[PDB]
């Protein structure tokens, strides 16, 4: 199952 | 042995189209089981191993939602990286990420990781403590500061200790007939002509799973790795792997050399020779 969190570079 | 769940993300800019393409794949050990491609019409998380197809619609819907969001975030990142590095829109660039959990012997997290690259170079990485970052240059220090401000490390540690391990355990049981069967190599040695005082013996290992293997040549038990040719382990196409090792030996002396195979699917190492 994927890590849902995205954080902009 | 130490099972793993890993995901691999690639985002690439396309100046021709003025956009980008995001592709993700997931693996349990050496078996790919899911993919996502933002170029697909109506892009969705898709099964790539038969055993993941027993997940219901909630799973496919929710994984798809995560990837659509992530894919957007990586398109913005490509623009940001372009600025950090004073690059124009004329050329293509690549932003990659990979993360995963290695399951210990006790079913506990042995090691969780999350790292990033830009144009093939290490960019930033979560340290082993799952608490802090290491940044590779000035640009990555800006990222590091942003992610510290927003406490991204706690989000990653939570995932790698919680859902990553929990879901891997489910996949391993779900697919136990394949993910937990060690498939031993089928092995043999072939013989071929060569050059001046030269005959080549090739020790084959075919159809093994998982991918890790040891192939070596010996004369009287002395390792011949200096003069042998060892090809990179390569996929069979059917989920298994292939590899071979070859050596030039003096004509008539074939029986002095033995090929040695170690693979977790064999009770004991194999010894074989030209027959």
């Amino acid at each position: 199952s994927l890590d849902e969190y995205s954080s902009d570079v | 042995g130490p099972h793993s769940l890993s995901y691999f993300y690639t985002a690439v800019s396309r100046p021709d189209r003025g956009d980008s393409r995001f592709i993700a794949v997931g693996y349990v050990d050496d078996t790919q089981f899911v993919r996502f491609d933002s170029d697909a019409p109506n892009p969705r998380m898709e099964p790539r191993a038969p055993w993941i197809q027993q997940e219901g619609q909630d799973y496919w819907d929710r994984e798809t939602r995560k990837q659509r969001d992530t894919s957007q975030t990586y398109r913005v990142g490509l623009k940001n990286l372009r600025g950090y590095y004073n690059q124009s829109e004329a050329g293509s660039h690549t932003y990659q990420s990979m993360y995963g959990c290695y399951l210990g012997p006790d079913g506990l997290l042995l090691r969780g990781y999350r790292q990033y690259a830009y144009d093939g170079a290490d960019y930033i990485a979560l340290n082993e403590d799952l608490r802090s970052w290491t940044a590779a240059d000035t640009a990555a220090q800006i990222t590091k500061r942003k992610w510290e401000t927003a406490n991204v490390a706690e989000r990653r540690r939570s995932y790698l200790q919680g859902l990553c391990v929990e879901s891997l355990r489910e996949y391993l049981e779900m697919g136990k007939d394949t993910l937990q069967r060690a498939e031993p190599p089928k092995t043999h040695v072939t013989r071929h002509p060569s050059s001046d005082l030269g005959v080549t013996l090739r020790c084959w290992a075919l159809g093994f799973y998982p991918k890790e293997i040891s192939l070596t040549w010996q004369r009287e038990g002395q390792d011949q790795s200096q003069d042998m040719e060892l090809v990179e382990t390569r996929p069979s196409g059917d989920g298994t792997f292939q590899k071979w090792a070859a050596l030039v030996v003096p004509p008539g002396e074939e029986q002095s050399y033995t090929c040695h195979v170690q693979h977790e699917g064999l009770q004991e190492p194999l010894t074989l020779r030209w027959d």
Binding site: - | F8, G120, G237, Q242
Partner: protein
């Protein structure tokens, strides 16, 4: 700096004339990911399936291009790769011994 592809061409099973098999072009170690990989039969491109783009711990990409084929005594197979690290396309020929 870009990294060039390594290329291996091989059959799934030991080849035997007249027996159906699979033909594999495995291409690995390369960066950036844009690449053209073509399986050839007597120089003409075959319509071969390509694996999903993935990469290794060192960030370099790998792809498998593969198709069904029935080897025999006359037909020649090769894999042809174009990448920015290659000024002329790389061509590796298939043979039963590698």
């Amino acid at each position: 700096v870009a990294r060039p592809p390594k290329v291996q061409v091989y059959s799934r099973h030991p080849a035997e004339n007249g027996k159906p098999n699979y033909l594999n072009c495995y291409v690995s170690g390369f960066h950036p990911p844009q690449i053209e990989i073509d399986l050839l039969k007597n120089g003409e491109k075959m319509n071969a399936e390509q694996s999903d783009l993935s990469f290794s711990k060192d960030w370099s990409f790998y792809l498998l291009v593969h198709t069904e084929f029935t080897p025999n005594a006359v037909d020649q197979y090769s894999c042809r790769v174009k990448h920015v690290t290659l000024d002329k396309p790389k061509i590796v020929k298939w043979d039963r011994d590698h």
